Amino acid sequence: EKDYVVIIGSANIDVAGYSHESLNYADSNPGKIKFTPGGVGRNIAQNLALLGNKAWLLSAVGSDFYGQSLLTQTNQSGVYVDKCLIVPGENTSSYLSLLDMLVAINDMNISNAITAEYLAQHREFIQRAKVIVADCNISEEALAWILDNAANVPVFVDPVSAWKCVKVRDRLNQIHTLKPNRLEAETLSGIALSGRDDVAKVAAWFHQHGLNRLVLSMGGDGVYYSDIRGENGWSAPIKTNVINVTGAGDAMMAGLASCWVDGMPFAESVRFAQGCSSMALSCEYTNNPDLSIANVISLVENA
Template sequence: HHPLNYADSNPGKIKFTPGGVGRNIAHNLALLGKNAWLLSAVGGDFYGQSLLAQTNQSGVYVDKCLIVPGENTSSYLSLLDNTGEMLVAINDMSISDCISAEFLAQHQEFIRGAKVIVADCNLSEEALVWVLENSGETPVFIDPVSAWKCVKIRDHLSKIHTLKPNRLEAETLSGIALSGREDVAKVAAWFHQHGLNRLV
């Protein structure tokens, strides 16, 4: 492990792992013995094929995923220094836009038949709103993903059954600073006043 030399080729270790917030949740549900389907989009590239194969191998049904020829499968690349600290990261997630309300509408009956719907804020606001307005009686669980992306759901909390924000996401959505334990109750009360059923 040597220090990084910029503008030069550096020896190092490169590791590929399947990921994605929704995919990881589906993967873990399958490991817990639950039936889990993934509705997502991948490119017609090697990474897309590999991701679908590995996800299916873990027990997740991937037959409803959209394969988009000519597009890149979502990827996240982080560069770490010799101490393990991140120097820079790049994400290429534009294919997420293909998970549109129109695409989801093609699976409306299937989605409404689920026991639980899990979505994350990597989806467009249009797609998230479609899920929340067309889920029927099925409870919707949301992972906000980031403070930047969670604002998409601020006006739709009453349609969400369970929300799992971290501290920054909870502060961003509620506008209340979490400075101490006493603030937790204030933030929780704010979410419930805005119609959220459960805050985790």
């Protein structure tokens, strides 16, 4: 109610291929192919809407049925998408994935339709939000715009990929919270993360470059959280049986931002976000439709 979250990210059409028993590179093996809504920013937005947050998605889609399906379904998930960009002439971004996991391919060129001018057309709206969530799928110039014209509003940035997260390197002094993985953080810092011993030096590198809060996900080991103010620590993983690994980081980011707007401490926010990730893990769907604050709180309580 007058408090909202703006997400500038990508909205993709996800094509997922599953094969019966084990799948090997040779021969055509029958299985299940799914067309599901996707895109880091879109997923984060949907999960935020599911967490009882007024989420506004600022993405770019095409004039094809894929785009309209994305927009309609996303709006139907409680996400305000009236300010989204529909580009007439270009194609909706796509993501092909062989899950279980083999190589993932992404055809995302409409993400560059999200421009400085487009965001500038929605200035003040972005500047009057509680939190701004951006992903590294957009253009470097757009990220620059958001970070420079945030107007003292915290910007939470999702790295998405290791080759796409360098765009915020020279700009870490403008990011409120980065959640990279091992490969991503190794890529950014240049320091090897070959252990649980080597995360202090990476965190130190990030803080020396101006990063306020770092949420480094180190698989098995857990999630290492660090604040530039001196607050460092480790968080243990919440025991869960996997079904689909897709959507973990998105649920984490949604949780983190929702917990920031809820006036929650860093560590507690890390546990809660880990709970959202855990709920994402337990679902076959990219986005758990039953994802709620109550369920996540129950999960962190009972574990």
